[PDB]
Amino acid sequence: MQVSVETTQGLGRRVTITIAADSIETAVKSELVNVAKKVRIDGFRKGKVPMNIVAQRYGASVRQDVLGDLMSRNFIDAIIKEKINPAGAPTYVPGEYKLGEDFTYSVEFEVYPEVELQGLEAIEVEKPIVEVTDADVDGMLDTLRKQQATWKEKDGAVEAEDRVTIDFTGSVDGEEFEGGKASDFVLAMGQGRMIPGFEDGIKGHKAGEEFTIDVTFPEEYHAENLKGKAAKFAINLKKVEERELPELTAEFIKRFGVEDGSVEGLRAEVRKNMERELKSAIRNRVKSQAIEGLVKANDIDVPAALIDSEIDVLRRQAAQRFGGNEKQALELPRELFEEQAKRRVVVGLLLGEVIRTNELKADEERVKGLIEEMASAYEDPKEVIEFYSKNKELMDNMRNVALEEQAVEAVLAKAKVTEKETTFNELMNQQA
Amino acid sequence: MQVSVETTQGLGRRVTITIAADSIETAVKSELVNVAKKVRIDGFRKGKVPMNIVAQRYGASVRQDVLGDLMSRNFIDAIIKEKINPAGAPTYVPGEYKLGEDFTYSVEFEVYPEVELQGLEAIEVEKPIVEVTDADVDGMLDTLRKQQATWKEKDGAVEAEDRVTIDFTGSVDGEEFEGGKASDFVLAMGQGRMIPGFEDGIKGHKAGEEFTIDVTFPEEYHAENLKGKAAKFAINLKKVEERELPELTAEFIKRFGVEDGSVEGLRAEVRKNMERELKSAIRNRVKSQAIEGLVKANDIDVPAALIDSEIDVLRRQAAQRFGGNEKQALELPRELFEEQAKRRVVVGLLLGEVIRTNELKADEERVKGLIEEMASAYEDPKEVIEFYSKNKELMDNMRNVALEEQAVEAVLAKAKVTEKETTFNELMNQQA
């Protein structure tokens, strides 16, 4: 019960305990026998030199490293039972050993965070008040007709959700880079298959037209050679499938969006889903300001252990998109992902404290409605409800999202919400 | 069935295989899905970018490292099923990558050796012919009476198998080293608890006598500071238990040798055991000359893989003796154990081919006799026979020893054996 263990830094802990002679040669000597038997390797020790005598005679000679072996044995045994699976090899960071002085070492394992909330009354929440006007309706109607163009060739009627066969070459400052080498490539526009700006700039151009587009790329880009670099892309565009002139074709109701729908059904389903995405837009718009305000108002120390964990996870997420790759994602630069990781860690901590202090729960009842609304986007909602509920991972992931809004709403009720009417331009600020 | 794989060095192998476009995007794409499902992580990939498209679009960009990941995945999956356990981290030794040329890498796993026999007719076996004379009997009887001294004090009647309390300090050339620091230490002489010569040199001295002893240490010693160093050891020797003057004490029949025995029983059992050790002495004497002759006559390339394996095992054997330690034995110098390891590897290879060519077997019947002879040194041979046979490890290890003599005897029947009479001094050559 009475033991002495210290802490170094991070998850590192320091042991090196001094015990009495009667304690040493009794407990330690016997303990070794027990561990040997546990692995059933006790019978493998042919002892010219009896263990009791040898450990007593040369015990002091390598007693330091004996402790090291024990430390090693406990560490491996502990990780297996705690279900901690380290990939590759952990880095053991020891200090310089001084002969005569004490020694300090790392050894990483368990974690434990603590948070506090301040500046809550300073949280000003902006709620934009918007509505649909005639101009919006007319614009929507005008756009819908412009999407009506069936199978035919030449000219140029590029759709914002169709297949465009693009022949292009990656040229930035008049120089060609490693990427940008593609042939007979079919790009689906509107799905976010390219860097923002690039797939949108195609709109308005004709097939067989050379124009070039101005793309600057994000500052936070995985490829340093292209980060914040203005690329031009010549775009020769030779053939392309194209679709001009509206006639009778039955594919615009079964090749667009999700599943296949009727003339009125497609409009209805698109209308609800468009408004559904509006929920995301408004919610994110509100969330970003709230988060930004808290970070600026309250600058606090951030645990590196949490950051490292998130960075490593982010690398997997990015690699998944990069090419569905893993493992090699480890070699990706830390700083490129650490900047956003800091934000994610802080957000989680802030939300978590709200959850702890108010004792929030993942409400299954609220989740029920969310699942049912999603299920209503399919031919049969009943099978979807069963499908979703028969998979723990889907339920759990949904609950995480549901909890996110619950945590925010709890904060909102405790904060200063101001409702202001605004223009559509302000809601277009979804760049970040 | 038609594949191309090359070899590099050691256990290293080179893959890097070129395939047609149809083969690539078909088999590789589908294989990834199968492996994902095997780990049941396929449902975790929320794909903004479809796998079929991303792996094609950016497939060539990181295709090299994709192969690397696959290589990584195959390696770990293979070792688990092959029951290969690597302790620590395997060093992946790659070469320098040239942009435009081919690449060569290691990656170690499976082994496969081959041997040939030559100079068999040149094997000259020395068989010493010796016999017991009256002088041997007189000397034996003389020695036996000299061991007859019972409990008492002072003077000095040190036995070559009793407990001696020695107070000593480790001093080599007038300098004290890290070791040699022991107090109240009870040393059992005759059992080989010390460096050959040190414990023997005690014989003849008196309790409370300062004399110093010349100990040179082996050239092949684990401690570099003491390897081939002449140590003196001052030896003060203050108390000691001692045993002088022969009276009636019942402990010389139950505190000597193995188990307890009667007056005639002890002599009889000692007599057979002494002759038993003679078998070992003669066998080793014959073996050493035979092995040494073969090595000098046939110098062949030795596979490093086998040597590395033996060295690591030797370090365990040495560490077991050092303090019953493992793991840290890894840090022990390679060159200090590699020299004897080379010999052990060569001997094993030579013996192995004898076994392969003549198709030798581990003769259970011969083993039965050996077990019975060992069992005949106990109070009840029957329980020992059951004891031994109910333990696979004991049986197997015994068979290894039995096989050793069988292999040697097979060689002897093919080699030139010459029987020569010799003196007892030549048989004392057991230093190596």
Distance CA B384, CA B373 (A): 11
Best of B69, B184, B225 to disrupt the A interface (most A CBs within 10 Å) is: B69
Structure tokens at B318: 């040495």
Q: Measured between alpha carbons, how far apart are the two ends of chain A, in Å?
A: 54
B45–A320 C-beta distance less than 8 A = yes
Contacts of B167 (CB under 8 A, 6+ apart): B183, B184, B185, B235, B236, B237, B238
The conformation of residue B329, written as its DSSP 8-state character, comes to G
A179–B323 C-beta distance less than 8 A = no
| Greatest extent of chain A over all pairs of C-alpha atoms, in Å | 98
B89–A88 C-beta distance less than 8 A = yes
Q: How many CB atoms lie within 10 A of CB A202?
A: 19
Tokens 């981290």 correspond to B89
Q: Which amino acid does the sequence have at B346?
A: V
Distance CA A196, CA A174 (A): 21
Residues of B in contact with A320 (CB under 8 A): 45, 47
Q: Which residues pair with B176 in a beta bridge?
A: B171
What's the CA angle centered on A122, arms A120 and A126, to 5 degrees? 105
What is the least distance, in Å, from the CA of B353 to any CA of chain A? 28
What is the least distance, in Å, from the CA of B404 to any CA of chain A? 19
A185–B62 C-beta distance less than 8 A = no
Q: Which amino acid does the sequence have at B286?
A: V
Contacts of B279 (CB under 8 A, 6+ apart): none
A32–B393 C-beta distance less than 8 A = no
Best of A44, A58, A313, A398 to disrupt the B interface (most B CBs within 10 Å) is: A58
Pairing relation of β-strands B13-14 and B6-7? antiparallel
In our burial notation (b when 16+ CB lie closer than 10 A, e otherwise), range B396-405 reads eebbeebbee
Distance CA A43, CA A347 (A): 56
B326 CB within 8 Å of a chain A CB: yes
CB-based burial of residue A11 (10 Å sphere; 0-12 exposed, 13-18 middle, 19+ buried)?
middle
Distance CA B201, CA B160 (A): 10
Q: How many CB atoms lie within 10 A of CB A168?
A: 18
Structure tokens at B323: 């303090």
Distance CA B260, CA B254 (A): 4
Q: Which amino acid does the sequence have at A105?
A: Y
Helix (H, G, I), strand (E, B) or coil at B269: helix
Q: Tell me the backbone φ, ψ of residue B287, rounded to 5 degrees.
A: -60, -45
Architecture of domain A111-149+247-432: Orthogonal Bundle (1.10)
Q: How many CB atoms lie within 10 A of CB B298?
A: 14
Helix (H, G, I), strand (E, B) or coil at B176: strand
Helix (H, G, I), strand (E, B) or coil at B31: helix
CB-based burial of residue A175 (10 Å sphere; 0-12 exposed, 13-18 middle, 19+ buried)?
exposed
Q: Cβ(B180)–Cβ(B171) under 8 Å?
A: yes
CA A362 to chain centroid, in Å, comes to 21
Contacts of B65 (CB under 8 A, 6+ apart): A325, A328
CA of A327: which chain B residue's CA is closest?
B69
Q: How many CB atoms lie within 10 A of CB A288?
A: 13
B100 CB within 8 Å of a chain A CB: no
Structure tokens at A296: 């600026």
B359 CB within 8 Å of a chain A CB: no
Intrachain domains A111-149+247-432 and A150-246 with the same fold: no
Q: Which amino acid does the sequence have at A77?
A: D
Q: Which amino acid does the sequence have at B358?
A: N
For helices A392-414 and A263-297, the axis angle rounded to 10 degrees is 60
Q: Put residue A350 in one of left, alpha, beta given phi > 0 → left and psi -120 to 50 → alpha.
A: alpha
Pairing relation of β-strands B124-129 and B163-171? unpaired
B323–A61 C-beta distance less than 8 A = yes
Distance CA B171, CA A427 (A): 87
Following CA atoms A198, A202, A208, A210 in sequence, which dihedral angle do they give, to the nearest 10 degrees? Answer: -50
Cβ-nearest to B57 among A43, A51, A182: A182
H and E: helices and strands count for chain B = 13, 6
Q: Put residue B88 in one of left, alpha, beta given phi > 0 → left and psi -120 to 50 → alpha.
A: left
Structure tokens at A229: 């670099």
Structure tokens at A253: 């109701």
In CATH terms, is domain A2-110 a member of 2.160.20.60? no
The conformation of residue B232, written as its DSSP 8-state character, comes to -
Structure tokens at A151: 């199978």
Closest by CA position to A70, among listed A104, A100, A41, A107: A107
In our burial notation (b when 16+ CB lie closer than 10 A, e otherwise), range A143-155 reads eeeeeebeeeeee
B323 CB within 8 Å of a chain A CB: yes
Structure tokens at B26: 């078909």
Cβ-nearest to B393 among A43, A49, A193: A43
Q: Which amino acid does the sequence have at A203?
A: K
B193 CB within 8 Å of a chain A CB: yes
Residues of B in contact with A32 (CB under 8 A): 324
Q: Which amino acid does the sequence have at A332?
A: L
CA B76 to chain centroid, in Å, comes to 30
Structure tokens at A272: 């609800």
Q: Tell me the backbone φ, ψ of residue A42, rounded to 5 degrees.
A: -65, -35
A182–B323 C-beta distance less than 8 A = no
Distance CA B133, CA A22 (A): 54
Q: Put residue A10 in one of left, alpha, beta given phi > 0 → left and psi -120 to 50 → alpha.
A: left
Q: Put residue B217 in one of left, alpha, beta given phi > 0 → left and psi -120 to 50 → alpha.
A: left
Tokens 């192998």 correspond to B13
Q: Which residues pair with B215 in a beta bridge?
A: B231
Q: Cβ(A269)–Cβ(A378) under 8 Å?
A: no
Tokens 């990584």 correspond to B72
In Å, what is the CA distance from A23 to each residue of A30, A68, B185, B284, B405? 11, 19, 19, 44, 47
Closest by CA position to B346, among listed B306, B377, B318, B317: B306
Structure tokens at B299: 């110098």
Structure tokens at B4: 């191309």
Helix (H, G, I), strand (E, B) or coil at B237: coil
Length of chain A in residues, anyone? Answer: 432
CA A301 to chain centroid, in Å, comes to 22
Closest by CA position to B336, among listed B322, B350, B324: B322
What is the least distance, in Å, from the CA of B400 to any CA of chain A? 15
Whether the CA torsion B113, B117, B123, B125 is positive or negative: it is positive
Closest by CA position to B282, among listed B412, B400, B118: B412
Contacts of B311 (CB under 8 A, 6+ apart): B334, B337, B338, B341
Best of A64, A178, A325 to disrupt the B interface (most B CBs within 10 Å) is: A325
What's the per-residue H, E or C state across chain A? CCCCCEECCCCCEECCCCCCHHHHHHHHHHHHHHHHHHCCCHHHCCCCCCHHHHHHHCCCCCHHHHHHHHHHHHHHHHHHHCCCCCCCCCCCCECCCCECECCCECCCCCCCCCCCCCCHHHCEEEEEECCCCHHHHHHHHHHHHHCCCCCCCCCCCCCCCCEEEEEEEEECCCCEEEEEEEEEEEEECCCCCCCCCHHHHCCCCCCCCCCCCCECCCCCCCCCCCCCCCECCCCCCCCCCCCCCCCCCHHHHCCCCCCCCCHHHHHHHHHHHHHHHHHHHHHHHHHHHHHHHHHHHCCCCCCHHHHHHHHHHHHHHHHHHHHCCCCHHHHCCHHHHHHHHHHHHHHHHHHHHHHHHHCCCCCHHHHHHHHHHHHCCCCCHHHHHHHHHCCHHHHHHHHHHHHHHHHHHHHHHHCEEEEEECCCCHHHCCCC
Q: Which residues pair with B127 in a beta bridge?
A: B419
Distance CA B283, CA A418 (A): 99
A328–B68 C-beta distance less than 8 A = yes
Structure tokens at A191: 């799905």
Distance CA B181, CA B169 (A): 6
Helix (H, G, I), strand (E, B) or coil at B419: strand
In our burial notation (b when 16+ CB lie closer than 10 A, e otherwise), range B92-129 reads eeeeeeeeeeeeebbbbeeeeeeeeeeeeeebebeeee
Tokens 């060095």 correspond to B9
Closest by CA position to A15, among listed A24, A25, A5: A5
Tokens 């022949």 correspond to A167
Q: Cβ(B49)–Cβ(A313) under 8 Å?
A: no
Range A215-220 contact pairs with CB under 8 angstroms and sequence separation of 24 or more: A220/A336, A220/A339, A220/A340
| Fold assignment, B150-246 | Chitinase A; domain 3 (3.10.50)
Domain ranges of chain B: 2-110, 111-149+247-432, 150-246
Q: Cβ(A372)–Cβ(A381) under 8 Å?
A: yes
Residues of A in contact with B327 (CB under 8 A): 69, 72
Tokens 């309390």 correspond to B165
For helices B392-412 and B381-389, the axis angle rounded to 10 degrees is 90
Report how many Cβ contacts below 8 Å link chain A to chain B: 86
Following CA atoms A244, A249, A250, A256 in sequence, which dihedral angle do they give, to the nearest 10 degrees? Answer: 0
What is the least distance, in Å, from the CA of A51 to any CA of chain B? 7
Distance CA A167, CA B371 (A): 83
Closest by CA position to B391, among listed A38, A40, A50, A31: A40
Contacts of A124 (CB under 8 A, 6+ apart): A293, A415, A416, A418
Distance CA A356, CA B396 (A): 62
What's the CA angle centered on B167, arms B166 and B170, to 5 degrees? 110
**Which stretches does DSSP call E strand in B289-400?**
none
Q: How many CA atoms lie within 13 A of A8 on its CB side?
A: 16
Distance CA B281, CA B216 (A): 24
